[PDB]
Amino acid sequence: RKQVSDGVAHIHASFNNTIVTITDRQGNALGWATAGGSGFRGSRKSTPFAAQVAAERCADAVKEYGIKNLEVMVKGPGPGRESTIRALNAAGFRITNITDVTPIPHNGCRPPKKRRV
């Protein structure tokens, strides 16, 4: 219901879930959709198919902003990292370039303890 004339896609990814968020270069969110809000829950939530659905869902949910040129910043080592890229390249999204923004601590904080199974 209003233009921003450009956009930036931010693919947050986790082993549990993948989140897709279209935002302006100024970092103001225009539209968002998660692979867990696509009707996929639990195991179904984490799969390249669910992220492919969430990508197009967010695309359409922002489509009224007339976004065309977008920059893709992908984060998190979970699956659907590229699936989401492809599934948002749909609807004529003119992809400028991609960038890996995954947070890499320089030996900063203690991680949780190894799980036994």
């Binding site: 998190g76 890996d100 991680p111």
Partner: peptide
Amino acid sequence: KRSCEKAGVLAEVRRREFY
């Protein structure tokens, strides 16, 4: 998928996942 892998970060997240 070449810079991503040869920069390793996918492996680093697994390694720093647990202590």
